[PDB]
Each structure stands twice: as structure tokens, then as C-alpha cells.
Design a protein around this ligand. Structure first.
Ligand SMILES: [Mg+2]
Ligand SMILES: [Mg+2]
Ligand SMILES: [Mg+2]
Ligand SMILES: [Mg+2]
Ligand SMILES: [Mg+2]
Ligand SMILES: [Mg+2]
Lengths: 894, 900
């Protein structure tokens, strides 16, 4: 009957669940629909002269009023699942709960005849509960949205600043982009919307997400392709979700938001998120458990009281009032508030959480995959030697590397920075004023080199390519030895291999450089122009390991996290780095060994292997996917161009604020600095946050089930309701006010010591265990008020009901300090000061409520002074019994 | 009347002032106490057999009852200035101050005759104030003592771990040593007490502090020299305050505490600590200022009220009651409570403060002198190339270095660790089995080498020495080139020099290794045996800069601290490291350059020089001393054997928890980890603590001066006391209770952005400026109570006095939020939550006291409800006026004294 249970209010699918991330592979629904492919094809070949009039765009850019007009016309650069609802809509959906409406209707029906100010006060209590829930949810979702917007991909636009009318280059969030807006693209920038290249040089974009081709594709300002016949392959348009590999460009936004190629009929807008993740499934399962409890218990109470006291319209109200404590509507408030408090406290620790549910995984992660550069090493190399094949230092190698590092337009490397810094000013200036760039062949993993074609004159050009030693040697036919040029024979090949292996075993990364002279040519150089090269030498450099890497790794191992290194570098350098930081590399697995293994074989091998070397991005993604095989939660750390699938293939993806745009787009956690200590501290605090959330749900559900059980067992014998439903609503409201400060509780270090596994079925066991314990003392209080205080007849019922009230509210508020931890309270474990203060305040308010002037309005009678010793005895006995009985639940259940 | 000043109570000279360190050297105030000297000469040559009976010591050690017996008989291993006084003595000295005594005496005199229960309650208020002060001082002194005991030099002793009699080797604090205790000594351990060596293995100790000789000397189990004639030069006794350079030993304690040669006569006991440091001088100046204010003001109030009301025994009591607000007895409570709260907080930042006054220096530091190794770079090296002179990798060089590193007993080095770890297990065990140790020639700065003599047989011995390249080359005559021993000509010398200079310019430190073969002999090896050596090669290793050194240096510069590098390494490696970490080396000055310079020349040069290289410890000490030339507070950070003179020479000395014993003993601050980020954060926190202390002192002084001024100007016109002195005592007590939370206040980041400078004369200007400003409103309240509320006669004086009381306490309590910060409160700068809570609580108590049942007992009368709007108006006007007037004080003099 789950199809009929629509009482659950799901959290918005931006606080939980991931973003679409337009990387949903090559599969497309009928390859886009008509009037979209045709529109893109028309836009590709549309002359640039009439392009300005179509979008009301000018070369100066867009001013304010124009950008707001365009945003109103075309919407906002977002997806329909990212716009928050208005606060009044949220308040209305919080009030239209199928339980609040029923409570108000039953209050009216019971008290429409000859007794007002009762239905009104019940409705007012319902409104106060709704307002409290709405306030918590709204504050927490606002904080979550602010934290998500803190780390957002930005685009560089013209716009208008200096209202006297001066252009500029503003970095604005990609959601503010409107159609017909001018942006500029450099290396590492993801495409923010469907573009139209106005003017570009050496612009290469990686489109493996959309067209499925790994090699980057050159994108020119004006089309040079004979026929298009396809919108995805035209060289003048750039689609959202792809990254810029190298070169520079300036383009115009043509589509925006849902109108983008991916955002319409190519993903995102195709159906919805039919499959929920682990966190959503767990929340739904807990909500279903609570609904089952209510639907099994409340009708029984209704039937019993209707058969006994013959007031059905009041018995139903009373049963609903006791059931409301077990409502599922507590779940959105609890989850949102606790996870948002955890996310804010993480943001104070240089950890930004993009969606709330990731916190669960960030506490459940037991395997952490990453690269050795930046996380284990310092990413800045200290020592570097530019030598030829004979070991002697050579200035020609340094100058060739300087050319290749200066005229390249790709992302800045550590070698590129060190080469540009280690070259003196005079020689650098001479080379810059003597050589000029012509062409650039970017970096791809099929050949693992990078080429730059420069020239000092108009007669001949020089192609200078640098890359890993083996890849360079594969395409070198001559070597410059002793100032002469000699064929690269096998003897020199093996000598170079041995010397470079010896260097690699010292932790020195070796990058070879080759140059070739070609006649002047008026055509674009291709990857086929990297043959018969002249090997100048190599550069050996040391990226030293961080001082805070070994303690961080030890702390991560203490927390239960297994660290695995997925690197594309050499096996020897990675092994040396792992040994220098205390990591046990064991036997290494290179990427060429897993290309023949089956999925089962590689999944079994990756569990024992610690270091994986010479991996392509596909290998990293496959390893991350197969490491989730045995119920493990895998976290992948990466900040590269090609880390988009792996970051998404992991159970949790972690990136850095200084990453490329797609790495931040595909990540779930963003670290403000690339450190493992920050990651470990964040994992600890997220474990505390998720433990607090579980504790809050657990205690609330258990106490409310105890109250419902007490009502169910001890209402048939009484000739009146044990507690008036108004008193129940006040009790629940004050308990919720007390519980507001549970997100701020303290968590034992023994609870967050190991990765957290969340079983929603444990809540049922906890409720069953800790409900009857409260019910026993509830029945004891009933007997005390029946016999000791002689509240026998209905006429003197207000003494009885109020007599339970101060017991119902106080114990429910005190039991929190007993069942929160697993140890003995107040000596080995103490609740946080905000929780202590809230408990004391709520206890004081509950004690003083029967004595307050409002007690006459709330149908509460004052209490004789002889009742307080009995109340203290009951509370102390309840606390002692639960403290002595916790051990049985600990042993038999957990 | 400087001699007449017995009112000032100084803090114990352990929270402030540095403990005596045994660096006296050429200092022999008492020269030689013959009685003491005769004892050593007898102890040195006394046979080991009868040594056990003299000190009641057994070879297995001492059990419990014996160790407490020896401690009771011989005292504890401490100096007389380090024993805390018992708590009851502290309470008595807190109660017997000449102001708590005169107050009670005058209360008895005034209220004995037919007006009892008034002198009693006055004495009760005085006792409550005394108890509050004593509790604060005792708690903070206990916290400071615990912090000092956290980082204390320890000694390894036998003792008795088990009830059955099993012996152990316990690390006990050096103060727990009793005479006749058996300890063991290794490299880097300082001598904790006078010792008699029971057994030794190549034990070399540095006695440069006592005898003034830099070269370490050999200590043997039995004497090997013909005549001693001098207790300090006997080769079988070790004296406290010296360090063990190398070797191992087991010795017996023969003297302890004051009885130690250093402790008695030669040092410490002679004379006393006549000269105080800067913090003690500032505290004394503040106390003298407060005493002068009281002595100027209180007699005038006494005379005025005696001539007006004709009750001298009440007028003097009243004047004393208003004056007590300006007592110096708050200074021990103010200083101890505020600083300790900072120090404890610093203990949570891995910064342990050994004595409280160091905090003032630690926030006032503007020049920081450190070494490049450990602070700027990691102490673990990543790359190393063991090659010969031709550049080819050589296994023989690595094996010789492994022998030298394995068989040396000195302090472990980074190169030693790298060489021990970089040799494979099979070859390492083969070398260990094949070679056995014979002798060791330790490291000293005159030659800057270290040698180990081993042997594979009984025919010949091999001497393996290692050290800096030039020092090894000076004593090398041949070189092993291409497997042949060839004479080391000048061409090879120049080639090696240029190759190693190229290596050094890359940040690589080069350590040369030489070996020699000698015929077997029986005598010990000397420094003259390092000649005609054979240079095997050198080891070039990379010590990478720390990841966090550049941000820490940027933060240190942003905080106003100028970092200077004093290193004994080569100038090329140090310059490369400085460039890597972002520091500007500028022009490097080597140690040999400054030897011929004068004091003025070197002092002028050190101010514009960032990196000093090739420095002997004497050069480091001289540079640190001369860097204090013009109002500069110098901090020296070192963790070496020879860094004690440089640590004690600086205005503040910072060391590391893992340092050698003498480095920790000579330091003022101990960092739990060797990091510059920790140092910068601790400096910021100490600046906050000192700002809070100064703030605490200036506010209590200004408000109480304002109250005294109001009384002086007003009480002449009135026909009765403006406030009963009982109410004044209550007001002062409640204000102190409110101010208890000041140590926990917040400090603006503007007050901690520069090295602080403390001027005791600024307090007088602050008091003069901010007293009348609150006397204005006291006179306004007097007029309000006189005319609006018709308290015109003594019969209704109780309404008048209480009318001032609520104004007196709340304003004094509220004004704190106005004058704690230079900015406008509650919008830019807000007080800390404990301070706000205490302010609210004290205001509530002051309002509710006249309405309480105790009001009749305290001679307080209930206030009409029409008085509250006037009170609120007065408080708001006072706050607004002081806020609008703070600007004038800021412009004319500046809110704080700062800059370098
Ligand atoms: Mg960008
Ligand atoms: Mg091109
Ligand atoms: Mg209950
Ligand atoms: Mg020791
Ligand atoms: Mg010897
Ligand atoms: Mg005043």
C-alpha cells in the first residue's frame, strides 16, 4: 500500500541528490529533437554580421537593464530542479500536512458546539508547531544554498561597470549568464552555456562527455569544415558541459538554462530523477517505518476510547494527537537542520559541502582514492637538473623547455612553472624576442606528449615537444650528443633507460624534450608531425612530499579509511613517494595489466593493491567503480581535467577550490586547500554530524513511541482521557523546542572512530526497546494519581491529566541525557552546554506551566506541594532503570 | 619616600624573572669556598667500594622509603627561589596588607562604641575581598606552576618499579633526585646534579659554562690524571649545568639542590637578585603611580571631612575606603590571573610558557633569530647522492659514512639518519659484524669534523671522519680516484670546490668523508690524528623547505616581526633556502667578517642584514646581544647544545619540546612542535593576553580615580558622607567580581597588529583623562538627590547615599564596555560573552541590593520608582559623553603604545 502513502514530504532534490552534470555519455534520445538541431545548425553557419541583431547584443557587451531584460525573457541559466520555492510556498506546504489539517478539523468538530477557545487554541498550537518546523527548515536550507553558492563555477563576461559606461571583465556565477552575452575562455574553463565562437586562437575543447571522443577538437571563429550535417560536430559552436583544453577564445552565449543542448531532450529535461540514492532511500524507509507505527497504533487507541467513553469525535482527536509525535514531518526538519549545522561547521574548517546528503558518505567513506601530486607531494618542485643524455648540464635543453612552456596555452604545470622560473631574465627575453609561436599540438593520453611549433624567421619552423621519457623516445630517431647529431641506436636507448630508471628510483621525475626543424608551411600541424625527432635531453626534478602527509595518512588509517593512490605517473616515482610518506605500496599494478583482466578479477585485485601506476582516466574510473563492489563507500579526490567521470563514479567526490571548472562541477565536497589533514578533520566532524542526526531521530521516535504505548495500554481502564490532547500538543511542542539544540550536542569519540553504516531498521529496534521503559513509569504515574492523590472521578480529572503532564514533559526531556551516549552520563560523557540549557529551561517551563495564569486557559490545574517528591522519585527511578538497561540493548542488539 | 614604601607586595620570583642557569662561567663571586672545594677533591678520588656506605646507596638503586628518607635529610633538588609557599602563608600575606589592616582597625575604632555589627560587617567585607584576591592568585599560580612543570628536564634513574624488588629506569623530573641516586647519561643529557662517575664509555661533556673551555673533556669511571688540585677539572666528577656531548655513562648523585657546586657559593647563593627585569620594573612603576595617587588624594579627603563633619575616626575610614579602590594589591591579582589565563590558553596552542612575564616579551618581539634547519626546512632529507670526487656513485663512501654514523655516540643528525636508512640490511649487518668500535673523536667548532676509529682486526685501525667539505679537505693529503690512492693536487682541489659550489647553489648540502689506516695502539686518539687523510668522496643531500614556512614568514612580517637567519652552514645553501621560502637574503655576512668588526659596526650591520652564515655559537650570541641596540626586543629560537648562551642572551628564548636538555633549561617558551605557524599564532595570543592585562589595569584605575575625585570635590559641600564606606566597600567588591571576567575579554585585531610596547606613565594620563568624565555625572547625581529627591538633611541621608550607590556601581560596571576599545561599541567591537554576562549580573545585583532584605543590615534604603528613569538617563548620558570624548584621547596621545 506504499502507493497510497503520500503523507511523506520529500526534501528538495538540491539539498539531497547530485546535480545532472552534463556528462551523461553519448546516448541521446533520437539524437535531440527537430527544431533544436536545426536551430544549432543555422546558428553555426549564421554570418557574424547578423548575429548581433538576433540576440540584441553589441560588441561592447550588455548593460544592466539589457541583462535583466534578457534574463526575464529567457529565464535564468539553471535547471528546473535548482530554483528554490518562495518562502510562502514553503510555509504553505509545511502547513498543509495531512496531519495538521486533520488535527484542526477534529478540533473544530469536537469543539464547534458550546465550547470555543478550545478548537482555536488547538489550531494555534498546530500553527506554532508548523512555524517552528518551517523556521528551522528555511534557515537550514538558506544556509545550505549559501554554502553551495560559495563554491560555484564562474564565467568571465564583459557586462557594464562604472555606470558612466565603461566595459570590463567580470567573474560572475554561470547562472547569471543570459543569451546574447559575450564571454572569454582560457585553458581549464568549462563551457557555461551553448556558445558561438566570435574569435579564437588555438582553441581546443574536450568533448568526450558529449560526442564520446577523447581527443580534443579545434574550434575556430569561422567554420572551415565543408559540410556539417550535425550540430555536435560543427567547429564554430561550443556546447555546455565541455572543457577548454588549450588556447584562447571569445564567444557569444546563444542558449541558456533548459534551452541548452543538454538541458533539453538530451538529459536533465528527460524524465526526472527516478532512482534515489542511499540517503533518500534511508529517509524514505524511516518515514515508512514511522507511518507503519502510527497506522498500527492510533486506530487501536481511537477504537478503545470510542468504545469506552463514547466520544468518537474526541477519541479520534486524542489518538491523532498522540500519533502526531510519530509523524514523518519531523524528518525534513531534523535532516535539514542537523546536516546544515554540520555543513556550516565544516565550512568553518575549509570544507564546503555542495549537497547535504554527501555528509553521510563523507562519514561513511572507508576507501580514499587520490593522486600522489598535491596531496602527498608539495606540487612545487625544489630541485631540477636539465641535462643531455650524457648527464652534463645543457642550456639547450633548458631553452627548448622554456619555449615549450612559454608558448604553450594549456594549463600551467609544475614543470612549466619551474622552467619559466629557472631561466634567467636575459635569456628568457632574448628567446621571447627571437622566437614567435605558430602552432600548438596539445596534450592527450594516447601519445602523452605536447608540441609547440615556433619560428625565428619565415624560412623554417622548429617543433619542440616535451613529455614522458618513453613516449618521447618512441618518436625520436636522432639524438644530439657532444654537440653533434647521431642516430639513436639501441645502445644509447638502453643507457638512457637505465640512467632514467636510476633517477626515477630516487623520486626524480624525468621529462624528455625533442626538437625538429621543418620547412615553412601554411597548414595546421597535426600529431603526425612528431616523427623523426632530435632528442635534446631530459629534465629530472624533485617534488618533495609534504611534512603533513605522513601524520595525515596515519590519522586516516586510524579513522578506518584505506588510502589508495591512483596515479598516471611512473611506477618507480610513485613507489618512492609512497615509501617516503609511510604508505605501504606493496606490489604495484600498472595500467597495462588491468586492460586484460575481467571485472571480477580487477575488483578482487584492487582490494589488496595499494598503488596503481600509469593509469589512464578510464582506468581510474573503472578502478573507482569496481572498488564499490563489496559494500564499500569509495571517495575519489581529484582536481584535473579528466577527473570528471571518476569524481562522479565514486560514492563521494572531493575536489579543490583551485581545480578546473569541471572538477568543481562534478565534485560533492570542495576543500579550500588541498590537504589531507583538512580532509581527515572534515571526515571526523561529518561523522559527528551524522551521528547527531541519527541520535535526534532516534530519541524523538523512541520517546514518542513510549508515550503512544502508555496511552494504548492505560486508557481503557480510566473513565477519562489520561491527558487532554491540548496538553499533549503542548508537551510535543516544548519537547521540540528542547530538541532544537540537539545538532549542537557532543558526540563520543568512540562513536565516530570507524566509518558509519546507517541501517534504518535499527530505529525500530531502538523504539521497541526504549518505549515500554517509559510506559512502565507512565503507568506508575497513573496509579499514583489515581490512588495516592484520589483523582478517581472525571469531575476531578484536571488534577490527573496535569499530574501526568509534568511527568510526560520532564522525563521525555531528561531521558535525552541518558540514552544519547553509550557510557555513564555526566562523568564519562556530557551533553553540550546548549543542550543542558535547553533541557533546564524546558523543565522549568513545564514545572511552572500548571502554576502560571495560562494554566486555566490550557485546562491545567495547580499541583500540591506533596507531588514534587513523588515526581523526583519517578524521574530518578526512570533514569536509573534506563541506565541499567542500556547494556542489554548494547549487547543483544548493538 | 622610596624607603617608606613597604605597601608594594611583589609577585614570587618564579612566575616572573628567569631561573638562574649555570652559565656563570668566568663569574666567581665567591671564587672558591674552601669548605666546599675540599669535599669534591675527596669525593673524586674516594674509592668506589666505600662510596656506597657514605651515601647509603646500593648498586641496585634506591627503594621508596630510602628515597623519601634521603629527600627529607638532604632537601629537594631545587633552588631556594623555586619552592612555593604554603597556601595559608599566601592567605596571611594577602590579608596582612597595610590597607586591609587599617580598614579593620578604623572600623573597630569608629563602630565599637554602641554601634557594633558595623565594624564586624566592615571586617567581613574586607575578608571577602581578601579571599577573592587570594583565590584568584592561588588558582593562577597553581596553573602557572603546572605549566612550568609540564616541560621540565628529566633524568633516567634506577629506583624500584616493583614491590618484589625489580629495578627500572624511570624518567623522573630533576627536582626529585636525592643524593646517592644512580642515574645514566647519554648524548644530549644535561647534568642534573653533582655526579660521581661509576662507569663511562667515551663520555665527553661540555663544561664551557663552568670552566670556560669550549672543547669537550673526557670523563672516566676512575681517575687517569696524576694530580687534580682543582675540583672543576677532575675527570671523574660531573657538575650540574653542563651537557653530555657524547658517550654513555652511569653515575651517582653526590650533591643536590643548594649543596651543588653551582647552587652554593660559586653561583646563585652569593648575594641575591638585586636587578629586576623589564616586567618587574613596569609593575613597580605602576604600583608606585597608584601609591602616589592615593597619598596625594586620600589625606585631602580626610582633612576636608574632618574639618566639615568633625568625625575624624569616620573621616579617615571614609578616605581609606575610597582610596582602597586605587590599591596596588590588585596588581598581583591582576597580573597573575590575566597572564595565567593566557598561558593556559597558549598550552592549547602547543606553546608552554615557563614564566608568566615572558608573555610580555613574546608579544613585544619584533626581531626573531632562528636557524634554517628545522624551522625553515624539514629535518628529514629527501634526496642524497653518495658519490666520489669524479661524480660517479660510490658504495665505499656510503659504507664509510655508515660506519661513522653507526659507531658515533653523539647526537643523532639528519645525515646520520639518512645514511643509516639508505644502506641495505645485508650490507649493514655485514659491516656491523665485520667492524668493531674502538674510539670516537667528537664534534667541536674549532675543527668542525667528527671522527670514529674502528677496526676489523687487531693489526690495524681505520679512522673514518666526516664533516663540511673545506674542513675535511684541510686535513686530506690523498684522494681515492678511480680506485687508486693519488695525491690530492691543486687541480683536483679547484675542481672539487667548483663542483660542490654548483651543488650548494642548488640547495644541496655536501658532507665530505675521509678515511685513514693506522697501526694498532693502546692510547686514546686525539684531534692531531686527523692528518694525511684519504678523501673517499662526499654525500650531497637535499633538505626540502617546509610547506608552511612561506605563509608563516608572511604572517610574521605582517605582525611586525623581522625574521633573521643565524646559521652555521654555508652561505650558498642558506641563501637558496631563504629564496625558496620567500625570505629575502639580501647580502649575506659570514662569521669571519664580523670578527674584526667593532660593537657599533656589527650592531649597525645586523639591522640591515637578514641572513648570517658560517656562524660559531659565540657569533650567534654576539649578534643576538647587539640586535637589542635601539629599543628592540629580540627573540632567539634554537634547540642545539650550544644555543643556551644565545637563548639567554635574547630578550626571549624559544625552544622545542624535543630539544636538548640545556636548550629547554635556558628557554623561556617551549613549543610542543617546531613550527613557525605555531609561533606566530602564539605571538598573536600573547599580544591579546597582554592587551587584556593592560586593559584590566587601566579601567580599574581610571574608574576608581574618578570615584575618589568625585568624593574629594563633592564631600565638602554636603553635610554628610556622600556614600557610607560600607557601601563603597560593597561597590568595590562587586566591581571586582564583575571585572573577574576581563581576562576572557575580546581584543580588537588593531591592538595586536604591531609589537606591543608598555609605558607605565600612560596609565596616569588615562586616569587623569577618564576620571573627571565620570565625576561630572557623580556631581550630577548628587544634585539630583539633593534637590529633586529632597535628601537635604542627615536624617534622610540614607536615601542620598543609596541614591549614589546604584549610580556608583552600574556606571563603573557599564563604562567598561565603552572604554575597552577605541572604536564604537556593539557595532564594530563587542565585549566577550563572559564579560557581558558578568556585567548584566552585577548590574542586576546592584539594582536589587537596596530592595533586598539585606538592605537594612547594609544601611541601604529602598529607591522610589521615579528614580529609575533618571538613573537610565544618567547612565546613557555618561556612555554617550565618554564615547564622544574618547576621540580626543585617541587623537592627542593615541589609544595604545606600539611600533618597534
Ligand atoms: Mg574561469
Ligand atoms: Mg592550430
Ligand atoms: Mg513519556
Ligand atoms: Mg634525558
Ligand atoms: Mg675513548
Ligand atoms: Mg564612578
Amino acid at each position: 500500500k506504499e502507493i497510497f502513502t503520500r503523507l511523506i514530504r520529500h526534501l528538495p532534490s538540491r539539498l539531497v541528490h547530485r546535480d545532472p552534470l552534463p556528462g551523461a555519455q553519448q546516448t541521446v534520445n533520437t539524437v535531440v529533437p527537430p527544431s533544436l538541431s536545426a536551430h544549432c545548425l543555422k546558428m553555426a553557419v549564421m554570418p557574424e554580421e547578423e548575429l548581433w541583431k538576433t540576440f540584441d547584443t553589441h560588441p561592447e557587451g550588455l548593460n544592466q537593464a539589457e541583462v535583466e531584460s534578457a534574463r526575464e525573457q529567457h529565464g535564468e541559466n539553471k535547471l528546473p530542479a535548482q530554483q528554490p520555492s518562495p518562502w510562502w510556498v514553503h510555509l504553505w506546504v509545511c502547513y498543509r500536512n495531512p496531519f495538521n489539517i486533520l488535527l484542526t478539523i477534529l478540533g473544530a468538530i469536537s469543539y464547534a458546539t458550546e465550547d470555543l477557545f478550545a478548537a482555536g487554541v488547538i489550531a494555534l498550537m498546530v500553527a506554532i508547531s508548523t512555524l517552528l518546523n518551517f523556521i528551522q527548515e528555511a534557515r537550514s536550507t538558506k544556509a545550505a544554498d549559501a554554502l553551495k553558492a560559495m563554491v560555484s563555477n564562474t564565467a568571465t563576461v564583459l557586462r557594464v561597470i562604472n555606470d558612466k559606461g565603461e566595459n570590463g571583465w567580470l567573474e560572475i556565477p554561470i547562472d547569471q549568464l543570459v543569451p546574447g552575452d559575450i564571454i572569454k575562455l582560457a585553458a581549464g574553463d568549462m563551457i557555461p552555456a551553448d556558445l558561438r565562437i566570435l574569435q579564437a586562437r588555438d582553441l581546443f575543447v574536450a568533448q568526450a562527455s558529449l560526442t564520446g571522443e577523447s581527443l580534443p577538437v579545434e574550434k575556430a571563429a569561422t567554420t572551415r569544415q565543408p559540410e556539417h550535417s550535425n550540430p555536435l560536430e560543427c567547429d564554430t559552436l561550443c556546447f555546455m558541459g565541455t572543457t577548454v583544453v588549450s588556447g584562447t577564445a571569445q564567444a557569444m552565449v546563444i542558449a541558456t538554462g533548459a534551452n541548452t543542448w543538454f538541458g533539453q531532450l538530451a538529459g536533465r529535461v528527460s524524465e526526472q530523477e527516478s532512482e534515489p540514492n542511499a540517503f533518500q532511500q534511508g529517509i524514505s524507509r524511516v518515514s515508512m517505518l514511522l507511518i507503519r507505527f502510527m497506522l498500527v497504533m492510533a486506530p487501536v487507541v481511537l477504537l478503545i476510547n470510542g468504545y469506552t467513553k463514547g466520544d468518537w469525535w474526541e477519541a479520534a482527536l486524542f489518538a491523532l494527537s498522540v500519533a502526531v509525535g510519530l509523524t514523518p514531518e519531523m524528518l525534513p526538519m531534523i535532516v535539514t537542520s542537523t546536516l546544515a549545522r554540520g555543513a556550516v561547521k565544516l565550512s568553518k574548517q575549509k570544507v564546503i559541502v555542495k549537497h547535504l546528503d554527501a555528509i553521510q558518505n563523507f562519514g561513511a567513506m572507508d576507501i580514499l582514492c587520490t593522486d600522489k601530486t598535491g596531496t602527498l607531494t608539495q606540487d612545487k618542485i625544489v630541485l631540477e637538473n636539465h641535462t643531455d643524455i650524457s648527464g652534463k648540464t645543457s642550456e639547450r635543453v633548458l631553452h627548448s623547455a622554456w619555449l615549450n612552456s612559454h608558448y604553450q596555452t594549456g594549463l600551467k604545470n609544475l614543470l612549466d612553472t619551474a622552467v619559466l622560473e629557472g631561466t634567467d631574465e636575459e635569456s628568457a627575453r632574448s628567446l621571447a624576442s627571437r622566437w614567435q609561436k605558430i602552432d600548438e599540438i596539445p596534450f592527450d593520453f594516447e601519445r602523452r606528449r605536447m608540441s609547440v611549433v615556433v619560428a625565428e624567421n619565415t624560412e623554417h619552423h622548429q617543433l619542440v615537444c616535451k613529455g614522458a621519457l618513453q613516449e618521447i623516445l618512441n618518436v625520436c630517431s636522432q639524438v644530439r650528443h657532444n654537440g653533434e647529431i647521431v642516430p639513436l641506436d639501441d645502445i644509447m636507448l638502453r643507457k638512457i633507460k637505465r640512467v632514467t630508471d636510476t633517477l626515477n628510483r630516487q623520486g626524480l621525475r624525468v621529462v624528455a624534450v625533442a626538437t625538429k626543424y621543418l620547412p615553412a608551411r601554411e597548414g595546421d600541424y597535426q600529431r603526425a608531425d612528431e616523427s623523426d625527432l632530435i632528442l635534446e635531453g631530459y629534465i629530472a626534478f624533485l617534488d618533495p612530499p609534504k611534512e603533513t602527509t605522513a601524520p595525515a595518512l596515519k590519522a586516516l588509517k586510524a579513522s578506518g579509511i584505506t588510502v589508495k593512490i591512483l596515479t598516471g605517473d611512473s611506477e618507480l616515482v610513485a613507489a618512492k613517494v609512497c615509501h617516503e610518506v609511510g604508505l605501504d605500496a606493496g606490489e604495484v599494478v600498472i595500467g597495462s595489466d588491468i586492460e586484460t583482466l575481467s571485472d571480477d578479477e580487477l575488483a578482487n585485485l584492487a582490494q589488496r593493491t595499494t598503488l596503481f601506476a600509469r593509469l589512464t582516466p578510464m582506468h581510474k574510473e573503472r578502478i573507482v567503480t569496481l572498488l564499490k563492489r563489496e559494500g564499500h563507500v569509495v571517495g575519489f579526490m581529484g582536481d584535473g581535467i579528466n577527473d570528471a567521470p571518476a569524481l562522479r563514479a565514486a560514492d563521494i567526490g572531493i575536489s579543490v577550490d583551485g581545480a578546473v571548472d569541471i572538477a568543481r562541477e562534478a565534485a560533492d565536497i570542495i576543500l579550500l586547500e588541498k590537504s589531507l589533514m583538512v580532509l581527515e578533520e572534515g571526515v571526523i566532524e561529518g561523522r559527528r554530524t551524522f551521528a547527531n542526526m541519527l541520535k535526534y531521530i532516534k530519541m524523538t521516535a523512541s520517546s514518542n513511541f513510549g508515550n503512544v504505548f502508555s496511552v494504548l495500554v492505560a486508557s481503557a481502564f480510566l473513565p477519562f482521557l489520561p491527558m487532554l490532547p491540548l496538553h499533549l500538543l503542548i508537551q510535543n511542542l516544548l519537547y521540540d523546542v528542547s530538541q532544537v539544540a540537539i545538532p549542537f550536542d557532543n558526540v563520543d569519540d568512540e562513536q565516530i572512530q570507524k566509518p558509519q553504516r546507517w541501517n534504518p531498521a535499527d530505529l525500530g529496534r531502538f523504539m521497541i526497546f526504549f518505549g515500554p521503559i517509559s510506559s512502565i513509569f507512565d503507568i506508575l504515574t497513573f496509579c499514583l494519581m489515581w490512588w495516592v492523590f484520589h483523582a478517581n472521578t472525571p469531575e476531578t480529572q484536571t488534577l490527573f491529566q496535569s499530574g501526568w503532564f509534568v511527568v510526560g514533559l520532564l522525563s521525555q526531556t531528561l531521558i535525552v541525557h541518558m540514552i544519547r551516549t553509550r557510557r555513564v552520563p555526566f562523568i564519562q560523557s556530557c551533553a553540550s552546554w546548549p543542550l543542558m540549557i535547553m533541557t533546564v529551561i524546558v523543565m522549568i517551563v513545564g514545572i511552572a506551566l500548571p502554576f502560571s495564569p495560562l494554566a486555566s486557559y490550557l485546562q491545567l490545574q495547580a499541583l500540591p506541594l506533596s507531588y514534587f517528591p513523588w515526581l523526583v522519585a519517578i524521574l530518578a527511578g526512570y533514569m536509573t532503570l534506563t541506565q541499567l538497561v542500556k547494556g542489554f540493548y548494547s549487547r543483544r542488539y548493538g
